[PDB]
Amino acid sequence: VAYTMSLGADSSIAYSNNTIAIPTNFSISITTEVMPVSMAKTSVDCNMYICGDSTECANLLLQYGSFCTQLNRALSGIAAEQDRNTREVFAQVKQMYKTPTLKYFGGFNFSQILPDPLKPTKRSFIEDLLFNKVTLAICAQKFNGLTVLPPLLTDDMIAAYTAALVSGTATAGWTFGAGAALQIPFAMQMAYRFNGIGVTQNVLYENQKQIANQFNKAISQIQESLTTTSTALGKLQDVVNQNAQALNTLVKQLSSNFGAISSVLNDILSRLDKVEAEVQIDRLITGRLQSLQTYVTQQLIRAAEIRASANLAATKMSECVLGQSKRVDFCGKGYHLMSFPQAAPHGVVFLHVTYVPSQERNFTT
Amino acid sequence: VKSFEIDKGIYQTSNFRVVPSGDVVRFPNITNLCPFGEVFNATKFPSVYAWERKKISNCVADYSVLYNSTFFSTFKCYGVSATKLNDLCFSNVYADSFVVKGDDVRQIAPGQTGVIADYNYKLPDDFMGCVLAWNTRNIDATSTGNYNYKYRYLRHGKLRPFERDISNVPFSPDGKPCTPPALNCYWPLNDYGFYTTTGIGYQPYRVVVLSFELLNAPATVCGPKLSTDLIKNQCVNFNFNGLTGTGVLTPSSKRFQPFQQFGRDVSDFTDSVRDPKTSEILDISPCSFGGVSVITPGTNASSEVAVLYQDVNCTDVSTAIHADQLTPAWRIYSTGNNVFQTQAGCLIGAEHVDTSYECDIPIGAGICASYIVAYTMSLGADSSIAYSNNTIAIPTNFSISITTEVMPVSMAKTSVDCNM
Amino acid sequence: SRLDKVEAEVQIDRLITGRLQSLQTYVTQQLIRAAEIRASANLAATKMSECVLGQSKRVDFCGKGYHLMSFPQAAPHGVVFLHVTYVPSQERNFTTAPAICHEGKAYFPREGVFVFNGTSWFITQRNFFSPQIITTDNTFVSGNCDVVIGIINNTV
Amino acid sequence: YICGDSTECANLLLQYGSFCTQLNRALSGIAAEQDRNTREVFAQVKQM
């Protein structure tokens, strides 16, 4: 069906002089957030990308300078900058801790948030559902010279870092980060977080299990809203798809003839004798170089966009996770009481513990 | 890096592979002797409007009567270079012989049809072998007259490639099946008038079109070569029916078909060979290769180096270390130790040290190095504390840590006279 | 030397070609680095406004302690940041009682946790051991004694 | 852009592979992100 748009949410109020909407109860909404931390660490043996070999091919490779060399520098920067982003986000931990795994405090079955000793995976099953939410299309060894080199950091130790953060967040008091820990008893912690939101702490005691049930039901609903559900998770996957697009594009242009007789090594070497041959080879060299240059260029372009994202990623690890970030709904879309980390292939997720007061009234002043 | 004092780090450099050791050359056992000395030695080769067609299969081609030759007036290979024709096994190829002047030979070309090649016989610009031509004014020129042989020069429309029609239509622009020469009713045929006396463009030349059915049946004719053994699981060379190459071979796991030969995995690769004497194996042309980066601590502790191979599983590492096919070959060269993990692969100069430190050198995936030595990784300052009832960390003295932070303001204001 | 004519110029245009393309390549990466560095420079001035020109209330963005002061220093193409932080160091082990039923009703001091029950002496900071003569101004009326934790008395 | 409506030059364009398409992918990603960010900066209070 085709329409313009229901442009938003239509209401209409004016002011009231003294009678005023004042919330007499409240709510908490934990939100998704998808931050792609590091795209695919890939490199090229350009020396075999172009020019598996004839040998004459390698002579002409020498005859077009150090393009392969400069792009190898480029790729090295690409990878290393992914790693820089990975680090600069990740091990912001002074003191690593140990997961207490006693796993019911305040009111909270924290199941699948931290991982388990009881399970053979040291990965938390929420994130493992995210792993299940990954789509795609010994050693890997193509004839293409194109590698996905492994990330430096172990994905399990990624997970260990995240769970450590979860622990030291849920423990260690407010000073968690620039220091070690504080041993604050976590009703007193989240009581103290009512003071950076600036309100009394009575209502915490008035709603001990209530806020708890809000919370654990909310986590449950997050599991609900993420298990079989819609595409609101895969910005990561968009980037992944783009990597696949570019790589597939690279190969399918490797298929391309460019006005020569063939489009692949030794096939040319059949019907060829002399430099006219190698002139056609130079055409191949030219276009492959171009596409390659374009490729790596846009890889760097993606890399800049992703480094911006990475800056955001470390930023929301900083202000939003470790403290209560007073910039309002930078982190989430409520008041951001807490937010807790989660990981992802190429990415990071967060659990934005907001705060919303909610019971609308009309009372004078 | 162009230096003599160098500091520490995983420093990437140029590439390696395994130089291929042997070769596997695969033919069928076919032999016959071609009628080259019949198709290029007879006289019964019909005219152009009856352009001849001979079939070639299951033979052996010499490619030697062609180059070591002075018989030929006008030779050029069109789709190919003549030089590496000897290294080509084909199947079922074709030739067309006819007797002409010395002027259609220019219009004998891909495209370029003109009159007679626009009315009698036709090519694409594509499916090209070679073209051979010579004079036979000494068999085919009676200055009394070659009134015997003809061509056609009348048609409705243009030709299509590789087509023959003999029909001497009582030709007319809009039909009219006539009794020529009733007016506007002729015939397409026309004689030759080939004389013994005449010059270059007009003496009868025997011309042969050499269309090369290539790689479209399992190769029946071969060039004068010799087949070899097989070499499983070793970086070697390939030379098939027309497929040379470089890599490793190993048998299939697949569901192959009777006509079939090639697999071309993502693109144009053939992936596999049904061997020309009944085997059906894979292909892995990537032997093992790739990049390397060296680790050195940086000229202020030592000068002892350690080598990172980046596409291996430690299989062929010590092999080509001793099989001596490593393109950064070394005279400063040992065989000491290898750590096996980070599936990029094998790292020489190294021991799996079980105790782990602060990860100087970021080896691949989780693994890291020190001194040299290498571990996986100490993940960070592991403590083990948890929640408390009431007892709680409070400060009474303190510290102030002024630290750096290091940021640019702007790179260099440069420019370029592009015109110099 | 050995040229005059358009074959000459064919080679020339090949030079033009390669030098043009590599030239553009230079320029393109230049603009890339320009973009990287300009965004970082935006962050730099952002901190210079933030860390230097005020006490940045957001935490651990300027420095990695607590940002007492921030002192800027120029450099060739760069700039240096003396982050006068604060990191606390002398760890204690002391106990508390959060809600106080003093006269039969609950008490929370100042939004600003840990009523110091090191024998119920004072009520302290977020980040220090500090002696405070406790007042009603250092609590509030919170209903009655129903979900209280500590039973502390003699509340001056 | 390259030959506006062509006969031969389209076949030549195919002989330059599929480049036009890839550049269009770039174009699409541009326009996509443009109005993405339009939504992002402005569609903030959905309550009108």
Numbering used by the authors:
A (entry chain A): 675 to 811, 832 to 1059
B (entry chain B): 290 to 660, 674 to 722
C (entry chain B): 964 to 1119
D (entry chain C): 723 to 770
Sentences from the study reporting this entry:
The spike (S) glycoprotein of the coronavirus is a class I viral fusion protein located on the outer envelope of the virion that plays a critical role in viral infection by recognizing host cell receptors and mediating fusion of the viral and cellular membranes. The coronavirus S glycoprotein is synthesized as a precursor protein consisting of ~1,300 amino acids that is then cleaved into an amino (N)-terminal S1 subunit (~700 amino acids) and a carboxyl (C)-terminal S2 subunit (~600 amino acids).
The S-ACE2 complex was then prepared using trypsin-cleaved and low-pH-treated S glycoprotein and ACE2. After 3D classification and refinement, three conformational states of the S-ACE2 complex were captured and determined at resolutions of 5.4 Å, 4.2 Å and 4.5 Å. The ACE2-bound states showed that the SARS-CoV S glycoprotein binds one ACE2 receptor utilizing only the “up” CTD1. The “up” CTD1 and the bound ACE2 are flexible, as shown by a 3D classification analysis that yielded three major ACE2-bound conformational states, in which the “up” CTD1s had different “up” angles (the angle between the long axes of the “up” CTD1 and the horizontal plane) of 51.2°, 73.3° and 111.6°. However, the “up” angles of the CTD1s from the ACE2-bound conformations were in the range of 50° to 111.6°. The S2’ cleavage site located in a surface pocket of the stem around Arg797 and covered by a “C”-shaped loop (residues 787–796) is inaccessible in both the unbound-down and the ACE2-bound SARS-CoV S glycoprotein structures.
